Design an enzyme around this catalytic site. Structure first.
Site, PDB file in Angstrom:
ATOM      1  N   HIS A  38       0.807  -1.208   0.000  1.00 20.10           N
ATOM      2  CA  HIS A  38       0.000   0.000   0.000  1.00 20.10           C
ATOM      3  C   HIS A  38       0.849   1.271   0.000  1.00 20.10           C
ATOM      4  CE1 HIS A  38       0.217  -0.472   4.545  1.00 20.10           C
ATOM      5  NE2 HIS A  38       0.482   0.815   4.413  1.00 20.10           N
ATOM      6  N   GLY A 140       3.284   5.399  10.249  1.00 24.88           N
ATOM      7  CA  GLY A 140       4.626   5.213   9.747  1.00 24.88           C
ATOM      8  C   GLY A 140       5.290   3.920  10.170  1.00 24.88           C
ATOM      9  N   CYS A 142       4.335   0.908   9.275  1.00 28.42           N
ATOM     10  CA  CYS A 142       4.126  -0.176   8.332  1.00 28.42           C
ATOM     11  C   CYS A 142       5.460  -0.598   7.729  1.00 28.42           C
ATOM     12  CB  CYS A 142       3.142   0.252   7.240  1.00 28.42           C
ATOM     13  SG  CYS A 142       1.451   0.304   7.866  1.00 28.42           S
TER      14      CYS A 142
HETATM   15  C1  LIG Z   1       1.135   2.084   8.006  1.00 28.33           C
HETATM   16  O1  LIG Z   1       2.154   2.757   8.697  1.00 28.33           O
HETATM   17  C2  LIG Z   1      -0.161   2.279   8.743  1.00 28.33           C
HETATM   18  C3  LIG Z   1      -0.044   1.767  10.234  1.00 28.33           C
HETATM   19  C4  LIG Z   1      -1.253   2.046  11.151  1.00 28.33           C
HETATM   20  C5  LIG Z   1      -1.392   3.578  11.272  1.00 28.33           C
HETATM   21  C6  LIG Z   1      -1.724   3.887  12.761  1.00 28.33           C
HETATM   22  N1  LIG Z   1      -1.438   2.638  13.506  1.00 28.33           N
HETATM   23  C7  LIG Z   1      -1.160   1.604  12.617  1.00 28.33           C
HETATM   24  O2  LIG Z   1      -0.895   0.462  12.959  1.00 28.33           O
HETATM   25  N2  LIG Z   1      -1.231   1.571   8.024  1.00 28.33           N
HETATM   26  C8  LIG Z   1      -2.412   2.138   7.612  1.00 28.33           C
HETATM   27  O3  LIG Z   1      -2.650   3.321   7.856  1.00 28.33           O
HETATM   28  C9  LIG Z   1      -3.536   1.358   6.846  1.00 28.33           C
HETATM   29  C10 LIG Z   1      -3.383   1.539   5.322  1.00 28.33           C
HETATM   30  C11 LIG Z   1      -4.382   0.749   4.471  1.00 28.33           C
HETATM   31  C12 LIG Z   1      -4.366   1.173   2.962  1.00 28.33           C
HETATM   32  C13 LIG Z   1      -4.154  -0.764   4.628  1.00 28.33           C
HETATM   33  N3  LIG Z   1      -4.836   1.791   7.388  1.00 28.33           N
HETATM   34  C14 LIG Z   1      -5.110   1.836   8.761  1.00 28.33           C
HETATM   35  O4  LIG Z   1      -4.332   1.392   9.590  1.00 28.33           O
HETATM   36  O5  LIG Z   1      -6.301   2.385   9.211  1.00 28.33           O
HETATM   37  C15 LIG Z   1      -7.419   1.523   9.468  1.00 28.33           C
HETATM   38  C16 LIG Z   1      -8.790   2.249   9.661  1.00 28.33           C
HETATM   39  C17 LIG Z   1      -9.502   2.843   8.582  1.00 28.33           C
HETATM   40  C18 LIG Z   1     -10.738   3.498   8.753  1.00 28.33           C
HETATM   41  C19 LIG Z   1     -11.314   3.585  10.024  1.00 28.33           C
HETATM   42  C20 LIG Z   1     -10.650   3.016  11.112  1.00 28.33           C
HETATM   43  C21 LIG Z   1      -9.406   2.363  10.919  1.00 28.33           C
HETATM   44  F1  LIG Z   1      -8.798   1.823  11.982  1.00 28.33           F
END
Ligand SMILES: *[C@H](O)[C@H](C[C@@H]1CC=NC1=O)NC(=O)[C@H](CC(C)C)NC(=O)OCc1ccccc1F
Lengths: 297, 298
Positions: A38, A140, A142
């Site tokens: 992603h 950040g 990920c």
């Molecule tokens: C990558 O760094 C990031 C890590 C998360 C950000 C905050 N804590 C984490 O563990 N990953 C992402 O942001 C994800 C990206 C997608 C395209 C897979 N999305 C995410 O973690 O958010 C999930 C979400 C979406 C909508 C409403 C609630 C919710 F928890």
């Protein structure tokens, strides 16, 4: 004490990967960098990304890979499930002996939490029965990876992709397959109902005994099936015969039969701790495996 | 929350083993000096009350075996600094990080790289208790393992492991060899003072609860530091110092809740109890997360 594997061998593989306005971590082994796919998304993409579409529209030169002060040249890219693989023109001399493994729920692993390619912390997690992990992951994080170390070999078992609304976390193995029913899209996702890792609770109770803590013990006993009936009632995993076998060394070490500890756990489930604590905790901890306990005693 | 250690790789690159006779413990190799507990030079006949100065006069450079892995490092000088042995070696460690030696305060946390025969086995987060013990996981052969914090590129070394007490807790020195607490490096039963609760860390925990929207326990009142300290001691909480007040500054700023107002809320919890309520999913107040730890995970 909850104890993580020494992380040095993994820290030497972490790099920073940027595409557009998106930066996260990658794992650089030999001449390949692995990261969550992603990274190629934008704001609009993330809600329902067609990853094959988005990926064919990318060039090798759209990927900025930094190992500290040094940019590595991407000479090729491909996708394996939810993991993007970037070939770079130079090999990592710090690459340890490693392998990729898919862990089973109830197994534990160390997480090296990284931001912008830089290690920030290390801690121990377990793969929950519902395939989440209770972690400390912020924006950040990920591309941070989870691992175990057997001898001089690093077994990579987890790469981090997302948070759920309950605050637990979800991710993939290094083949890019999620643990659990999750998807790498920007949506609120719910997990299956979580259950407690029984064999780990039992291992932890043996640990409290090894450390001279034994108030929860009783003289009662139980059969394995009657214990599993009560376990399942309280949303604990049933105990398999291999789980019993795995508990032998701790049983031997303390002279407490496995089913005797099961009878003690059963009393705790039905009655609680009534103010009392075990190893400092007011709750029964289930993120210590038999091996984790033994290795530390 | 969870206990989170610093990445251990910069410290792993400094671990070696030091052997006298059959006695092997760990040492810390920085530039061209190896630091280890002086009791590596003790025999069993010496353990109850060694004469370290007389034991050292009998020692020559060529009696010390220092190894990184199976690779010997030749010792070219030796000295004793309090309870630590310093061994000058003929090779400067190419993996030496930026580092400093710091003596921490009670309540501060640090990561421990638990090592055996110079090989790291695990890393975990420890708190220095108000009685200058730590609740570690150390087996035989762990002496010389170190505790550290990492600030940017710079490792601050704060602890070197020397012994276990009857109660199962552990005691050791800073990297200048000065014990934390009243302990000595002799094979004797020694008792620590009564442990107390680390007030500054409990306050940090309450701030963390507030940052996460868990704020039922906040009250409309305040207190003086002296009044709080006098009450705290009656509940076996450590009195706050001016440094404790100061390191709570950032969390106080982040939340807009003055330190002394949070103290009044804590006082009411101590006097009234929790009344069957939780804070951050707990009926217990946690005292092993510092204000810095809270900021890290938030
Ligand atoms: C990558 O760094 C990031 C890590 C998360 C950000 C905050 N804590 C984490 O563990 N990953 C992402 O942001 C994800 C990206 C997608 C395209 C897979 N999305 C995410 O973690 O958010 C999930 C979400 C979406 C909508 C409403 C609630 C919710 F928890």
């Amino acid at each position: 004490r909850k104890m993580a594997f020494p992380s040095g061998k993994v820290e030497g593989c972490m790099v920073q990967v940027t595409c557009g306005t998106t930066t996260l971590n990658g794992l650089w082994l030999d001449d390949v960098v692995y990261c969550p796919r992603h990274v190629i998304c934008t704001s609009e993409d993330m809600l329902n990304p067609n990853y094959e579409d988005l990926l064919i529209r990318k060039s090798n030169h759209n990927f900025l890979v930094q190992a500290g002060n040094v940019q590595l040249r991407v000479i090729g890219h491909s996708m394996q499930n939810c993991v993007l693989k970037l070939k770079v023109d130079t090999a990592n001399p710090k690459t340890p002996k490693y392998k990729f493994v898919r862990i089973q729920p109830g197994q534990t692993f160390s997480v090296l939490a990284c931001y912008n390619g830089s290690p920030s912390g290390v801690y121990q997690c377990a793969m929950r029965p519902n395939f989440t992990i209770k972690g400390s992951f912020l924006n950040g994080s990920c591309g941070s990876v989870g691992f175990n170390i057997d001898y001089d070999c690093v077994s990579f078992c987890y790469m981090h992709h997302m948070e759920l609304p309950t605050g637990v976390h979800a991710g993939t193995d290094l083949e890019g397959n999620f643990y659990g029913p999750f998807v790498d899209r920007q949506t609120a996702q719910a997990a299956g109902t979580d259950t407690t890792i029984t064999v780990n609770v039992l291992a932890w109770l043996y640990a409290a005994v090894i450390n001279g803590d034994r108030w929860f013990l009783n003289r009662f006993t139980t059969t394995l099936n009657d214990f599993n009936l009560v376990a399942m009632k309280y949303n604990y995993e049933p105990l398999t015969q291999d789980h019993v076998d795995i508990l032998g060394p701790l049983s031997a070490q303390t002279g407490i039969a496995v089913l005797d500890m099961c009878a003690s756990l059963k009393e705790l489930l039905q009655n609680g701790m009534n103010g009392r604590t075990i190893l400092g905790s007011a709750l029964l901890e289930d993120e210590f495996t038999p091996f984790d306990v033994v290795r530390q005693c």
